[PDB]
Design a protein around this ligand. Structure first.
Ligand SMILES: [Mg+2]
Ligand SMILES: [Mg+2]
Ligand SMILES: [Mg+2]
Ligand SMILES: [Mg+2]
Lengths: 116, 113, 116, 113
């Protein structure tokens, strides 16, 4: 799949399981249209969000519901979510892994971009 | 000022200077209304964004224009921007720190009294 | 394998390929004894460093030669290396993934620890 | 002072207070010789570690006792400590920033003139 999301929990040293992720694509009228969504697996991965044919050029937003994740663990975190906004496939189709590392008051996000 | 932003450059090991940051407050219709903005200083800071009286409880978004920063340095970046969305909750000072790399960023909140 | 190392390059958005990694284990006389070493693959992973039987309890150090990595890319980085020091298998055998995210003047390291 | 250390806590969103930090300088026989140490302040900083005259070129190691910090908070940590090893190279001020989580840490150098 050309778009995968991987989420890790920096407090427990584990995948972040059952984290909701929502993908949006910017429309011609500048609004965020829903594109795909899912939940992280026991491996912290969100697989199968899209296909090569559907994942056209565009500006995409991945919104990870980190607040609900921490709250279910008893923690009141700082952020409402972690959101990653990027232009995709501008120079041809690529494969994107969005990795997020979560702490209650901090997160990091990194992209690994590869050419199929 | 109850809200400060500090931006660092992980490639050059320096403050990220002249980066635009925009602050928005969520409105009743769930749209983002402009609240404050500025350009980071020589020390990578956005100062004077708001006041105690203005910075009431609510959901705020800080957008840092990282793409224009990397484009100025001649380095191809991944993100359009770095976004930090949080609820302000009543004394608390909020420092939003952002550490920038072309294909990665981290953001941390230091909330003090 | 109970000990894997994964290294990512935050400048290029890619695995960090051909990075040397050296593992040491603290000896009874408090010195760092060599334990294993290797180089990251095209996937940025260092596989096969040890075995379940050999990876006993102890204090381990993973030293990743980040300086040579950046230098070969034309960059003079801040750090001599990234080194991760931890107690392993204190409550029974575990599987450890040491992930490192590299920038010229910054690195992050995270451990994902799982129970087989 | 040409060398400052700042430590932040990513779980509580605060400076990491009362964290011990030790600075070592590599000796000719490749051993680590103690150079300076302290405990972080209320603001998470180690100040006054060295002077311009003392802080000559060489390889330095900063060891932050993160394990004792997390143990004080009652949180099981992964690392024995956070270690930052670097060559000081001739005006430059070095700020070593460390962002701590129980199973993760990041360190960044801000080098300014
Ligand atoms: Mg085109
Ligand atoms: Mg209230
Ligand atoms: Mg025992
Ligand atoms: Mg010289």
């Amino acid at each position: 799949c050309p778009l995968m999301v991987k989420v890790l929990d920096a407090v427990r040293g584990s995948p972040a399981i059952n984290v909701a992720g929502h993908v949006f694509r910017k429309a011609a009228d500048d609004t965020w249209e829903p594109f795909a969504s899912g939940k992280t697996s026991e491996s912290g991965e969100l697989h199968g969000l899209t296909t090569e044919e559907e994942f056209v050029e565009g500006i995409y937003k991945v919104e990870i519901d980190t607040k609900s994740y921490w709250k279910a663990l008893g923690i009141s975190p700082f952020h409402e979510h972690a959101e990653v906004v990027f232009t995709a496939n501008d120079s041809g189709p690529r494969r994107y892994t969005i990795a997020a590392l979560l702490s209650p008051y901090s997160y990091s996000t990194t992209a690994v971009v590869t050419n199929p």
